[PDB]
Design a protein around this ligand. Sequence first.
Ligand code: BCL
Ligand code: BCL
Ligand code: BCL
Ligand code: BCL
Ligand SMILES: CC[C@H]1c2cc3[nH]c4c(c3C)C(=O)[C@H](C(=O)OC)c4c3nc(cc4[nH]c(cc(n2)[C@@H]1C)c(C(C)=O)c4C)[C@@H](C)[C@@H]3CCC(=O)OC/C=C(/C)CCC[C@H](C)CCC[C@H](C)CCCC(C)C
Ligand SMILES: CC[C@H]1c2cc3[nH]c4c(c3C)C(=O)[C@H](C(=O)OC)c4c3nc(cc4[nH]c(cc(n2)[C@@H]1C)c(C(C)=O)c4C)[C@@H](C)[C@@H]3CCC(=O)OC/C=C(\C)CCC[C@H](C)CCC[C@H](C)CCCC(C)C
Ligand SMILES: CCCCCCCCCCCCCCCC(=O)OC[C@H](COP(=O)(O)OCCN)OC(=O)CCCCCCCCCCCCCCC
Ligand SMILES: COC(C)(C)C/C=C/C(C)=C/C=C/C(C)=C/C=C/C(C)=C/C=C\C=C(C)\C=C\C=C(C)\C=C\C=C(C)\C=C\CC(C)(C)OC
Ligand SMILES: [Ca+2]
Ligand SMILES: [Ca+2]
Ligand SMILES: [Ca+2]
Ligand SMILES: [Ca+2]
Lengths: 255, 318, 280, 57, 56, 56, 58, 56, 57, 42, 41, 43, 42, 41
Amino acid sequence: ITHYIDAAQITIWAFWLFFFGLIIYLRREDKREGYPLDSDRTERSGGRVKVVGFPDLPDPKTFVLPHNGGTVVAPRVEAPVAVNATPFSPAPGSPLVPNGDPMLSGFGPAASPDRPKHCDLTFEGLPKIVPMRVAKEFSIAEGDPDPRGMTVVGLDGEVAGTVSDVWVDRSEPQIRYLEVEVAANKKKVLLPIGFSRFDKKARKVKVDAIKAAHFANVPTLSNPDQVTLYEEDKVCAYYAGGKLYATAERAGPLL
Amino acid sequence: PEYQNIFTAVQVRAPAYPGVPLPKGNLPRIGRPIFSYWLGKIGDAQIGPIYLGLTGTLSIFFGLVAISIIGFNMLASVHWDVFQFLKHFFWLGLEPPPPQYGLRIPPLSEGGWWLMAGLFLTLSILLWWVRTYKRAEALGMSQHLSWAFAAAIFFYLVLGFIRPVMMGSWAKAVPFGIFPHLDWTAAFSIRYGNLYYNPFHMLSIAFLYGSALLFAMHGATILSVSRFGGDREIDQITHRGTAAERAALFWRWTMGFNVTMESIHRWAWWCAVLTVITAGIGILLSGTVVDNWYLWAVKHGMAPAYPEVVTAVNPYET
Amino acid sequence: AMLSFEKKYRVRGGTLIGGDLFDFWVGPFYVGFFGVVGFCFTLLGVLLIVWGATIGPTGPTSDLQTYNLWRISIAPPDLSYGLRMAPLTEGGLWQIITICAAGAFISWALREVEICRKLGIGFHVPFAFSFAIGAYLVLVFVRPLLMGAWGHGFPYGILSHLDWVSNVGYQFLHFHYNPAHMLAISFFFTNCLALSMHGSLILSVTNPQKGEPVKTSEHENTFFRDIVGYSIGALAIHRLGLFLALSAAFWSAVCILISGPFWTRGWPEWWNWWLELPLW
Amino acid sequence: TMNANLYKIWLILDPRRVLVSIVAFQIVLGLLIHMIVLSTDLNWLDDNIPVSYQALG
Amino acid sequence: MNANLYKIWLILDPRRVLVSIVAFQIVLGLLIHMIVLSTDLNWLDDNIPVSYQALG
Amino acid sequence: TMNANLYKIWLILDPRRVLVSIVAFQIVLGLLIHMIVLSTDLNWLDDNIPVSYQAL
Amino acid sequence: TMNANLYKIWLILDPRRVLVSIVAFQIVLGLLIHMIVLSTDLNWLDDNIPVSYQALGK
Amino acid sequence: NANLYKIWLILDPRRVLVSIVAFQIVLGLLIHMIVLSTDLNWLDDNIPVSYQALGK
Amino acid sequence: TMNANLYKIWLILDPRRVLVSIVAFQIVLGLLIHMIVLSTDLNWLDDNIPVSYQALG
Amino acid sequence: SLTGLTDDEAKEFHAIFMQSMYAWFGLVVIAHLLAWLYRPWL
Amino acid sequence: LTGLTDDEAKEFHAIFMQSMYAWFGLVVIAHLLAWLYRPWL
Amino acid sequence: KSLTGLTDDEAKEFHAIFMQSMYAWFGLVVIAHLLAWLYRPWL
Amino acid sequence: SLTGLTDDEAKEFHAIFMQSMYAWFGLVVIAHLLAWLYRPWL
Amino acid sequence: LTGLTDDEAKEFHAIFMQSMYAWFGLVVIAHLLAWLYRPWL
Ligand code: BCL
Ligand code: BCL
Ligand code: BCL
Ligand code: BCL
Ligand SMILES: CC[C@H]1c2cc3[nH]c4c(c3C)C(=O)[C@H](C(=O)OC)c4c3nc(cc4[nH]c(cc(n2)[C@@H]1C)c(C(C)=O)c4C)[C@@H](C)[C@@H]3CCC(=O)OC/C=C(/C)CCC[C@H](C)CCC[C@H](C)CCCC(C)C
Ligand SMILES: CC[C@H]1c2cc3[nH]c4c(c3C)C(=O)[C@H](C(=O)OC)c4c3nc(cc4[nH]c(cc(n2)[C@@H]1C)c(C(C)=O)c4C)[C@@H](C)[C@@H]3CCC(=O)OC/C=C(\C)CCC[C@H](C)CCC[C@H](C)CCCC(C)C
Ligand SMILES: CCCCCCCCCCCCCCCC(=O)OC[C@H](COP(=O)(O)OCCN)OC(=O)CCCCCCCCCCCCCCC
Ligand SMILES: COC(C)(C)C/C=C/C(C)=C/C=C/C(C)=C/C=C/C(C)=C/C=C\C=C(C)\C=C\C=C(C)\C=C\C=C(C)\C=C\CC(C)(C)OC
Ligand SMILES: [Ca+2]
Ligand SMILES: [Ca+2]
Ligand SMILES: [Ca+2]
Ligand SMILES: [Ca+2]
């Protein structure tokens, strides 16, 4: 006997039903941050219309933090935060332009959310990211130079200061920040390893993100022996603003 | 110029971590950890320690027996000549039993060793699955790894056990050998009328390509935000930072939508898992349900048609 | 609309070409010069694909014209046209769509560079996307050029390009023995394993067993040391995944590039250099 | 000849790991020997002794 | 048997052993049923007491 | 001919690792030698000695 | 004729690693040479000397 | 040369020794392998006699 | 006709790395050249000169 | 102790364990007696 | 060293040896039944 | 003091038991091969 | 002393090493005598 | 540079050369025997 329907055809159709169900599941999970959307439709509706697209948002999940750190929920209602910028044009879809000195505006690649004002912790409950002054069990791996005492140069090759310490991850041993004693003001500021190139034979750290004089305004730590999530983002974002803001040419275009 | 965060320029050292303490009933870990400078250039310099209870000890014993039976038979097939074993290594193999034996345990001289290696490798893998399950349980972690491992085991089982049993013959299973298992792969497509026309083969390719697409995207995305600590995905997930915001906006502005730091790992999980689910289903249907995938595709209207520029008289017709 | 945290990142500038002229978004999409340029290449290419489906290989009235999604095929020219432009109905349509595709892809990558400049992030993603583009260009430009005809490109058809792959592969009798192909596949498989391991680990520590708090960096490292005696690290797994995926694309491009231009016999026979070493 | 201080081996080798490794080794060995013998003339399942049950039907 | 064999449960976790015995035994049972079905002893396809496909 | 201070080797080589290595090596070597002998004319399992046990 | 201060080699090379290496190397070499010899006419297992034990049963 | 001894001020004596030992063992294995692949083969040359022929 | 100040090359290049590189390159080169020659008509091992020693058996 | 059980707790577990294992083996014997009666294999 | 006291090592040894010998006695009985049923040398 | 941590007396005691156990092992090997030579002489 | 041994320890170890090596080489010579008598290969 | 003093480099070189010459001597002897048994050129 012959039939057009066969088991291979049945099974492939069954797969499509599963797969489209899976995609809808995934798109819901994708909306646990950043939704509902900031639109001009919600503004004029007086907030009546929430823009969420399809599928709609999932019910909130809870993240229980260790060491009695509290509970995080997702999705969550997050308060609007003023933008320190003015639109270049009033038309929708236009960019904005930072107010004041761009490096210091907290806008564009200088921007960042306000992370929590407590430190990431080791499993045992100590501050995770700390200078080698504090975690004395750490050493420099034999074969590699000690960054302490190296001179830090900005994007234009001028001396910004000297490395005064190294900040390490106690959970997963690696350098996360260099501590820079800034020549101009004698403050000690963090420098993320992600923005640092070593010139080993010269014992120099090169920082392409900012000029030497920009080190004077790197955001400062409340406590010299630990760093909060909040301060980590403020530090890293300040260097990143330099990628677009630190010189005029960086605005573009090429042509 | 900028630091790309591909290689660690300056490593630091601390006393080796012995690991998160395990609950009562777990055995103490074994090994004195060492440090590799060159591994420390690309990743973690620490090697060891390792956990080894009953599950893993049994797994490793079964697995070494299986591997040794294969290597032994390869060397015997060049008459113990170690130099010819190195010459022909990629060609040598441990061969499935002849078709005359069906699914019966075949003689030691002609297929018994294949059947024993498949049995003992399979038990070794199943026990390794239990190991991945137990190691998550002892740390209080969920079982995502063992579920994905089970999907790969499903495909492996279909190749060497389920389909051969359904088809009535160990001779239809896979040989243990480098080039021999490539012969088997090509011959399987030939025998079943071109695996390109198997729709679960097409899906498995979409998901294998998609896995490389997604790890290239995600790997590169995270390194581009590692300057903001984006590689620390636990705290970016509980406490969204500018790493996670910039990652999502890069993709939203590029292609119109984006995921979250947690949910990209769900996309990645399913893409990889569906590679081997669809692969198992595709092989499971070959020979049992569909005997010629090209003709199955003709029947369901899928095969392209071309202007005829070559053609051959069938001498069986003449 | 914008993500609820997005407005504070929508900055002016960072373009490579265009400046204020095209420096704007359209809904979620950033546009810019390469958005406009890429949009034109893209819309043209797609519409020429639909036009090619509309007329088929031998005209819209023949039995070969079809809108069946699996059977639509737009094919390159005969090898006899060499490096010249064929007539539109004899493969030239494929050639124009190819140029559109390359321009759409490259414009997409440069748009990605402008987005990285706005966000002040590294350039890893457009760098990585360049490997996929490079493989596509090996297939339709470098390898056809080295053999002397654009007609060595693959056809634009969902199933018809699988026929191309099959027949190019079996020109070398047993393509599995291509050494760069073996290496590339090893990277594809290892990448899929690594991706499932990485996805699993992040989800299992952020979604732990009921009653458990979110797990730690120490748990992640401990978990794979417990299984394999080694943990590569949370930064390095992303280095590794990028290395495996780009290596898979790179050795793919190499493996088709040597198949024809740098080797014409069967692929198993390449291994005779090994068999013929005067050691055995 | 055994040794009167042989008991001191358990001051050297951990008793738990020894027990675990013996159990594991003997399970694999037991399965291996049964399969090896079933692959030879000594096979007692397919020997049609006392009768062939596939021939009855 | 030794009078203090009960002391095995002072060094080997009883719950772990019990669970490992149950899973070992279930897999062993599947394995042996599979082995026996691969031999002359097969009781499913022996057509005893009768062949039911041969009745249709 | 042997040496009187040979016991001092255990001041050099760890007794535990040495004992473990010995029994692992000897077990693997014994598996290997039985496999080699079974693969040759000396095979004692399939030699039909004292009789063949496979009945027709 | 070796040197009188040759014992000073154990001031340079670790006696432990040397003993372990020699033991490991010698075992592997022993396995290798037995296999090489078995692969040739010198084979003492499949030479049916003194007798063929399979012939007895076949 | 009279100042050749100073090479040990440049190259680690320990690593040179280990490297010499490792290279010489590999070379020795390689050369035996190469020579055995040819007409000079002394193991399979049936000299003084074929022992497999003896067993026939 | 070498230069009088050619010795200053060692103020530029590490004398240790050149030495270890020279030894490594030369060994690899010597292995490669022997294998190349053995792969040609010049092969001096399998040429049955002075005699074929397999022909003795 | 290593497992946490006291001495009397190991004694109690052992008595219930040995009784249950023997009951399980008793079932295995009944099943093999039935199987031998139906289809003797030696 | 393992952490056992000298007396603990004595007690474990006595139970270990009695249990192993009992296991070996089962193995011996099994091979006696197998040899009577199907002698293999 | 020592590389292993055994004392001089401890190494002597371990050596005594190790040599006796190893010789008992070799004695079984010899008996096994005497049995094997009588059953199936291979040279 | 790079290895940590004193000069007398290196002297004591050498004596026992050289003696054991020669005894091993003695066994190897006896083995090859028997093989040459049983099955000469040159 | 390695840590060896000048005198140490002298003593190591004397033994190194003496030992290497001893090894080369055996190679010549083995080769001589090989040529007498199976001349290859
Ligand atoms: C008998 C046939 C042969 C065979 C013949 C060949 C031939 C011939 C080729 C391969 C190629 C490959 N083969 Mg092979 N191969 C065989 C069997 C195998 C098996 C197996 C399990 O047996 C596997 C695992 C592989 C694996 C591989 C990969 C290494 C490689 C394909 C990946 C690639 O090119 O990525 C690179 C990725 C790309 C080229 C994609 C580019 C994407 C572009 C840049 C973007 C597109 C955007 C898109 C249009 C957007 C649409 C938008 C939506 C509509 C919204 N082959 C057999 C034995 N193989 C190919 C290769 O190496 O190509 C380089 C190739 O040409
Ligand atoms: C012609 C070939 C013979 C045959 C000859 C032999 C010989 C000879 C032996 C076996 C042995 C076994 N055979 Mg058999 N066997 C045959 C056919 C079978 C069939 C079958 C479906 O045909 C099966 C399922 C078995 C099953 C068994 C197992 C009960 C046992 C392997 C146990 C083990 O590995 O423990 C490994 C686990 C450990 C060592 C852990 C140790 C801890 C303690 C000491 C053990 C506790 C577990 C439990 C009590 C063991 C039960 C054994 C007792 C009989 C209750 N045989 C036939 C008819 N068989 C062996 C045996 O009986 O051992 C005593 C053995 O010596
Ligand atoms: C026709 C070819 C010959 C043959 C010719 C030779 C020749 C010639 C030699 C051997 C050697 C060995 N042969 Mg053989 N051999 C044959 C067949 C066999 C068969 C078999 C199943 O047929 C077996 C299992 C063996 C096994 C052995 C080993 C006992 C020994 C190598 C051990 C080693 O590498 O130590 C490496 C380990 C170390 C160096 C660590 C330190 C050594 C420790 C302290 C001592 C270990 C035990 C010691 C080896 C006991 C040897 C006692 C007898 C002399 C065998 N031979 C036949 C009949 N064989 C070699 C030997 O006798 O060495 C003395 C050797 O020279
Ligand atoms: C023509 C065919 C010839 C043959 C011609 C050659 C020639 C020519 C040479 C060898 C050499 C060797 N041959 Mg051959 N060889 C033959 C057959 C054999 C067979 C076999 C199973 O048939 C075996 C196993 C050997 C084994 C060996 C080794 C003893 C030696 C390589 C040692 C080494 O690499 O040290 C490298 C390791 C080091 C240098 C480390 C430092 C020193 C170590 C710690 C001490 C090693 C002791 C040494 C092996 C003592 C033996 C010296 C004797 C004079 C042979 N030959 C036949 C019959 N053979 C070589 C040799 O004799 O070297 C002196 C050599 O020149
Ligand atoms: C999503 C689908 C993909 C996938 C998923 C996947 N695979 C997985 C997992 C997952 C989620 C695991 O959790 C598991 C794993 O543990 O990975 C780290 C596994 C795994 N995938 C593996 C391999 C693998 N997966 C493959 C594929 C894939 N895996 C997919 C593409 C491939 C391919 C593509 O062919 C291979 C080759 C293993 C790495 C691991 C399963 C390991 C296992 O079962 O081990 C038991 C088997 C043995 C043979 C044990 C042998 C023991 C060793 C020889 C070590 C010897 C030790 C000894 C003590 C040495 C002593 C010597 C002395 C001298 C010192
Ligand atoms: C290099 C490792 C892997 C990789 C990485 C990679 N790919 C990437 C990226 C990266 C890092 C991006 O950033 C980019 C992206 O934005 O992803 C969301 C992209 C991407 N990889 C994509 C596809 C993709 N990548 C693939 C592969 C891979 N990409 C690798 C294995 C494949 C395979 C394997 O076949 C495909 C199908 C897209 C999702 C996206 C690029 C999107 C883009 O360029 O948009 C512009 C173009 C269009 C919207 C359509 C253009 C239409 C043409 C003008 C006409 C069509 C012509 C075409 C030649 C016809 C083909 C027909 C038949 C073959 C069916
Ligand atoms: C051919 C037939 C189809 C073939 C398809 C095969 C698919 C199964 C094979 C793969 C096995 C996966 C096992 C793990 C699963 C898992 O892990 O899911 C659990 C996790 C959640 O865990 P957590 O992280 O939240 O917390 C961990 C703490 N316990 O993820 C998910 O919820 C994914 C969501 C499931 C996907 C939904 C699909 C719905 C389809 C509906 C179709 C409707 C059509 C109706 C038509 C009438
Ligand atoms: C001499 O060698 C020594 C000893 C030195 C060690 C060296 C070992 C070496 C070199 C080994 C090399 C191994 C290689 C190169 C292996 C390559 C293997 C490959 C490529 C394998 C690929 C695929 C194989 C598959 C998928 C096989 C699957 C088989 C299965 C799933 C069989 C299952 C069988 C079962 C469950 C049997 C049950 C038996 C029953 C119960 C039915 O009995 C009646
Ligand atoms: Ca029977
Ligand atoms: Ca017998
Ligand atoms: Ca013999
Ligand atoms: Ca000879």
